[PDB]
Scaffold this active site. Structure first.
Site, PDB file in Angstrom:
ATOM      1  N   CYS A 137       3.568   1.861   9.369  1.00 39.35           N
ATOM      2  CA  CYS A 137       3.442   0.730   8.456  1.00 39.35           C
ATOM      3  C   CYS A 137       4.798   0.274   7.947  1.00 39.35           C
ATOM      4  CB  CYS A 137       2.493   1.058   7.308  1.00 39.35           C
ATOM      5  SG  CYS A 137       0.867   1.629   7.845  1.00 39.35           S
ATOM      6  N   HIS A 166       0.810  -1.223   0.000  1.00 35.22           N
ATOM      7  CA  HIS A 166       0.000   0.000   0.000  1.00 35.22           C
ATOM      8  C   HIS A 166       0.855   1.293   0.000  1.00 35.22           C
ATOM      9  CE1 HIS A 166      -0.102  -0.086   4.528  1.00 35.22           C
ATOM     10  NE2 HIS A 166       0.180   1.194   4.307  1.00 35.22           N
ATOM     11  N   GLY A 180       2.523   6.373   9.442  1.00 36.06           N
ATOM     12  CA  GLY A 180       3.938   6.237   9.121  1.00 36.06           C
ATOM     13  C   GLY A 180       4.570   4.982   9.703  1.00 36.06           C
TER      14      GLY A 180
HETATM   15  O1  LIG Z   1      -4.041   2.384   8.802  1.00 33.29           O
HETATM   16  C1  LIG Z   1      -2.986   2.753   8.289  1.00 33.29           C
HETATM   17  N1  LIG Z   1      -1.807   2.717   8.958  1.00 33.29           N
HETATM   18  C2  LIG Z   1      -1.465   2.667  10.268  1.00 33.29           C
HETATM   19  N2  LIG Z   1      -0.765   1.714  10.859  1.00 33.29           N
HETATM   20  N3  LIG Z   1      -0.951   1.841  12.229  1.00 33.29           N
HETATM   21  C3  LIG Z   1      -1.724   2.869  12.417  1.00 33.29           C
HETATM   22  N4  LIG Z   1      -2.073   3.445  11.229  1.00 33.29           N
HETATM   23  C4  LIG Z   1      -2.826   4.703  11.019  1.00 33.29           C
HETATM   24  C5  LIG Z   1      -3.099   5.570  12.198  1.00 33.29           C
HETATM   25  C6  LIG Z   1      -4.211   4.804  11.555  1.00 33.29           C
HETATM   26  C7  LIG Z   1      -2.864   3.056   6.796  1.00 33.29           C
HETATM   27  C8  LIG Z   1      -2.902   1.757   5.963  1.00 33.29           C
HETATM   28  C9  LIG Z   1      -4.273   1.531   5.378  1.00 33.29           C
HETATM   29  O2  LIG Z   1      -4.715   2.676   4.628  1.00 33.29           O
HETATM   30  C10 LIG Z   1      -4.786   3.827   5.373  1.00 33.29           C
HETATM   31  C11 LIG Z   1      -5.790   4.718   5.028  1.00 33.29           C
HETATM   32  C12 LIG Z   1      -5.991   5.852   5.794  1.00 33.29           C
HETATM   33  C13 LIG Z   1      -5.180   6.081   6.884  1.00 33.29           C
HETATM   34 CL1  LIG Z   1      -5.479   7.477   7.886  1.00 33.29          CL
HETATM   35  C14 LIG Z   1      -4.152   5.221   7.216  1.00 33.29           C
HETATM   36  C15 LIG Z   1      -3.940   4.069   6.455  1.00 33.29           C
END
Ligand SMILES: O=C(Nc1nncn1C1CC1)[C@H]1CCOc2ccc(Cl)cc21
Ligand SMILES: O=C(Nc1nncn1C1CC1)[C@H]1CCOc2ccc(Cl)cc21
EC number: 3.4.19.12
Lengths: 304, 304
Positions: B145, B41, B143
Site C-alpha cells: 500500500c 489507512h 505492505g
Molecule cells: O488490502 C490491503 N492491502 C494490500 N494491498 N495489496 C494487497 N494487500 C493485502 C494482501 C491483501 C490492506 C488495506 C485495506 O485493509 C486491509 C485489511 C486487512 C488486510 Cl489483510 C489488508 C488490508
C-alpha cells in the site's frame, strides 16, 4: 495477491547509461567505474557489417573517435580495447552513480530485466528470459544496441546481457559483459538462423505454482506422473527435459502449496495434451515460461 | 522489432519512495517536495478497517506518531492533513530527488507503470491498465500500500495512482494522488464487488496494429465492417463500444500500416467470433488490451 511479469527497478542501471558515437553510428554504452562498455559494431558502417574484420577496422580508430556522452556532458576517452565483441572505453571519470555490480553469464532459461535505451536515454523496462536456443524475444529498435539485461540482489546489480543485434527472424542476440555471445551468433549481418525455441519446463511449473498460490486452481487434477513419463510428453511438445535438479529447485514452491512436483507435472501433462479449453491461468491463455522458480518465490514473498 | 509489455524506467519514482509507519502499520509513501503522500489507512489497526471513522481516528494522531524514513534516515514531520483518502505529511526537508511532476486522474483504459514497494523499498516494476470497472490487476502483497502508478513524458512524471487495497476477489483498488478512489471503492474492509471487467477495445486494436508492424499478419482478413456492426459484436463479447474518438486516436497507426481502422475492426470481429484456433499474436494466445494507441506508437518509435 496477483502475479505480474515484473522487471527489477531500473534506477541503478539508468545511472550507468551513456551514448557512444563512432563516426555515423550512435548506440548505448554502460558506464561502470572509469569504463564504458558497448557493442564493438559501433565502429562499423552498414557496409562493414556484411563481413567486418573488427581488428582491422579498430586500427583506424583512436580514443578521440569514440564520443561518449552522459546526459549532456562529454566524457574524455583515455583508452580503448576490444574484449571479444565488446569495446571497453576507458574514461577519465569514474561514474559517480556506479552501483555495486558483477558481470554474470546466465544459463538458458534464466530471466532478467532489460532497460531499453536510445541515445543513452532509457525508454522502458521489461522482463525477458534467455531462451534455450540462446536468443531473447525483446523489443529493440535501431539505436537500442548496447541496452543491457540485469538482475538485482538487494543493492548488487548483476549485468548479464548487452544487446547487439536482431536476427532476420526478428529474435534478438547479444553478449554477456565480457563480450561473449550467448549462443552461436556472431556480430555480422549474415544468415544466422535460430535453433528450436523449446519451452522452459521448470519455469512453466514455477508459474503453475504461482497460479495456485494466487487462486487459479482449475488445472489441478487427480493424477501424478514420473520424471520419465513426464519427459516423454515434454519431448513431444518441445518442452525442455525436467531433471531432478529442476525438481529440487521447485522444492520450496512444492512445500508452500502442498502439491508434490510430480503431481504438478501431471497437471502440466494434461494441459499439454488437452489444451486450456478456452480457459486462462493468471490471465494468460498459454503456459508462461519466463518466470523462474526464484522469480516466483521472490514475487510471492516481496523481496525488495 | 518485437513488442513487449514495457514499463517506464522507474528511477525517478524510486527516489521518491519512503516508508511511513503509524503505530504498528508500515506502508509506503511518496515524497515530493516537502510532502509525503500515503494511504490514510496507515492510521488504522486491522480492527479499525472494518468500519473506520478516519476523522475520529486522525484526532488521536500527532505529527510525531507518523514515522517517515527515507533509506536509513528519518524525516521530521512538521504537519499532517487528510485529503480525501490520502494523508499528506509535511516534512522539514524537500526531497532532493524530487523530479518534475504532475498529479493526474486517468480514465478507464489508460495504462501506467507501477513501482511495487515494501517498507519504502522498490521490489519491481510492471505495466498496468485502469480497467473499465476502475480496478487494476496488479501484484501487491501486505505492505505494498502506498506503491504508486505513473507515466513519464521525457522528464515529467505524471503520478496517477496510489495503491490502497485488494478486494476479496483479488483485484486492486486505489486512488489518484488527490486521494480520490478510482471507482466506487472505499477504504474499508467490506463487501465491495467489482463490476463487469470489459475489454478495452481501442487498446486491442492498437495491439493488433503493433502485431502487423512487428510481422504478425495471419489475422488480417478480406473483410471490413462499420462502427455500428462492430459494436454489436463488441457488446456480445463484453468489449467496450468503439467510438469515432477511438477511430481518430488509432489514425496514426492506421496511416503507418495502411490498414483502415474499420478493416482492423473486421479482423477483430472474426477473432472474437472464431477464436485464435490455437495460434498466437505477439506471443499471446488472447487479445491483449493493456497497450493504448499511444503506448504502441511510443514503443514502435523509441521515445526516451
Ligand atoms: O488490502 C490491503 N492491502 C494490500 N494491498 N495489496 C494487497 N494487500 C493485502 C494482501 C491483501 C490492506 C488495506 C485495506 O485493509 C486491509 C485489511 C486487512 C488486510 Cl489483510 C489488508 C488490508
Ligand atoms: O540489428 C541491429 N540492431 C538492432 N538491435 N535491435 C534491433 N536492431 C535493428 C532494428 C534491427 C544492428 C546490429 C547489426 O548490424 C546491423 C545492420 C543493419 C541494421 Cl538495419 C541494424 C544492425
Amino acid at each position: 495477491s496477483g502475479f505480474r511479469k515484473m522487471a527489477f527497478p531500473s534506477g541503478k542501471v539508468e545511472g550507468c547509461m551513456v551514448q557512444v558515437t563512432c563516426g555515423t553510428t550512435t548506440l548505448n554504452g554502460l558506464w561502470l567505474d572509469d569504463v564504458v562498455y558497448c557493442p564493438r559494431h559501433v565502429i562499423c558502417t552498414s557496409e562493414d557489417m556484411l563481413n567486418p574484420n573488427y581488428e582491422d577496422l579498430l586500427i583506424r580508430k583512436s580514443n578521440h573517435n569514440f564520443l561518449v556522452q552522459a546526459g549532456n556532458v562529454q566524457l574524455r576517452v583515455i583508452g580503448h580495447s576490444m574484449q571479444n565483441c565488446v569495446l571497453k572505453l576507458k574514461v577519465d571519470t569514474a561514474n559517480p552513480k556506479t552501483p555495486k555490480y558483477k558481470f554474470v553469464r546466465i544459463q538458458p532459461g534464466q530471466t532478467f530485466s532489460v532497460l531499453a535505451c536510445y541515445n543513452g536515454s532509457p525508454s522502458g523496462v521489461y522482463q525477458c528470459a534467455m531462451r534455450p536456443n540462446f536468443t531473447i524475444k525483446g523489443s529493440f529498435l535501431n539505436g537500442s544496441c548496447g541496452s543491457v539485461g540485469f538482475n538485482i540482489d538487494y543493492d548488487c546489480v548483476s549485468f548479464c546481457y548487452m544487446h547487439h543485434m536482431e536476427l532476420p527472424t526478428g529474435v534478438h542476440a547479444g553478449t554477456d559483459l565480457e563480450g561473449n555471445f550467448y549462443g552461436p551468433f556472431v556480430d555480422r549481418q549474415t544468415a544466422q538462423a535460430a535453433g528450436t525455441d523449446t519451452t522452459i519446463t521448470v519455469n512453466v511449473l514455477a508459474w503453475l505454482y504461482a497460479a495456485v498460490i494466487n487462486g487459479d486452481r482449475w488445472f489441478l487434477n487427480r493424477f501424478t506422473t514420473t520424471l520419465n513419463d513426464f519427459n516423454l510428453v515434454a519431448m513431444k511438445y518441445n518442452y525442455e527435459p525436467l531433471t531432478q535438479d529442476h525438481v529440487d529447485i521447485l522444492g520450496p514452491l512444492s512445500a508452500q502449496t502442498g502439491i508434490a512436483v510430480l503431481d504438478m507435472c501431471a497437471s502440466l501433462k494434461e494441459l499439454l495434451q488437452n489444451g486450456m479449453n478456452g480457459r486462462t491461468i493468471l490471465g494468460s491463455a498459454l503456459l508462461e515460461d519466463e518466470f523462474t522458480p526464484f522469480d516466483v518465490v521472490r514475487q510471492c514473498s516481496g523481496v525488495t
